[PDB]
Each structure stands twice: as C-alpha cells, then as structure tokens.
Amino acid sequence: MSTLIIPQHYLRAILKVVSSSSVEVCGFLFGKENRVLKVRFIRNRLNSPVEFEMDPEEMLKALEEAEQENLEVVGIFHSHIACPPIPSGKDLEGMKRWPVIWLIVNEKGEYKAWILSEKNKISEVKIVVE
C-alpha cells in the first residue's frame, strides 16, 4: 500500500494508552484496503519495555472475530519507549511474516507508518488522520 487512513479517535486512544504504559503496546488495525475501521489491542506476553510478542490466544481470537465481520488486517501497531517511531531490525522480521502496514508510536505522541515490499525493503507510508 501507499497511505494509511486511520480515524482520529482511534489514533488518539492508542497514543493515550501508550503514554502511560511502562511496556510496549501492540495490536491490530482491521478494515478495508488501507482504511482502519476497527482496532484491537493485544496483550504483550513479554511484558517488556523493549520488545513485544502477541499473546497467541488473544491474537487468534481477534483475527477470527475480524473474519466474521468481513474485515481484513490493514496493519499492525506497536510502541517504542523513549526512541523515535522508526522500524528496528526486530521489526523487520515480524514485517516479513505479517507484510501489512506497521504503525509505530511512542510515549511522546510521535507516530509513523511503514511497509515492507516484496524486495524486503522498508518505505515510509503517509498517514491521513480521518
């Protein structure tokens, strides 16, 4: 894709949850094409300020729920703590397994979105806050 369309109230809520969390937050962006219609936070089973891994049971329940609603996974979101919202090498491997839009945010309210092409090259994607 080339651009992420996300409603303001969802983006503001993600930033607020992140602003007061001591560990990395993670979740799904569900919708159609490039547009976010639903958000699901998922437990970070590492409970860590520097890495995240989704609870597998919560993840699967969320994907099955979205399937019932006829929604695609538009993207994944997660937070960084005390560093800018740029994909890390750790993010690179997860983006290979889930090659959708990756929204990264931090506790200072910064956010950027990224995508991994078939040539395994990352490019930034523009965000429109709806």
Binding site: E24, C26, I42, V50, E51, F52, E53, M54, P56, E57, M59, L60, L63, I76, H78, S88, K90, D91, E93, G94, M95, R97, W98, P99, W102
Partner: protein, 57 residues
C-alpha cells in the same frame, strides 16, 4: 493442506510447523478450524492453518 496466514500462502503438529518454518513458540496452529497443541496427532486429510505470532520491538 498447509496455509500460513499473514503472507497467506497455501505425524504431529510440531513437525508440520517446523516443515513450514516455525516452532511452537513462534506460531499457533489450528486443524480443521480447531486449535491444536504441538504433539497433537495430525491426520491425512485434515486442513491446517499456521498463524505466525506477531513480534518485534
């Protein structure tokens, strides 16, 4: 009979996970639409989905 979701590409379940590039800690599997554990027996005509655990930092 092996669909890995995310990229959306199409014995016991531990071997079918290692056969497609994962282990029990990095993916969750469901057979015929039902969750299964690592040493659960796989049958010849069943349908398996491999769900990579989203991770990063």
């Amino acid at each position: 009979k092996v669909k890995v979701i995310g990229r959306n590409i199409e014995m016991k379940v531990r071997d079918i996970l290692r056969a497609v590039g994962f282990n029990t800690e990095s993916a969750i599997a469901k057979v015929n639409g039902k969750v299964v554990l690592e040493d659960d027996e796989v049958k010849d005509g069943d349908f398996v989905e491999v769900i990579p655990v989203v991770s990063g930092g």
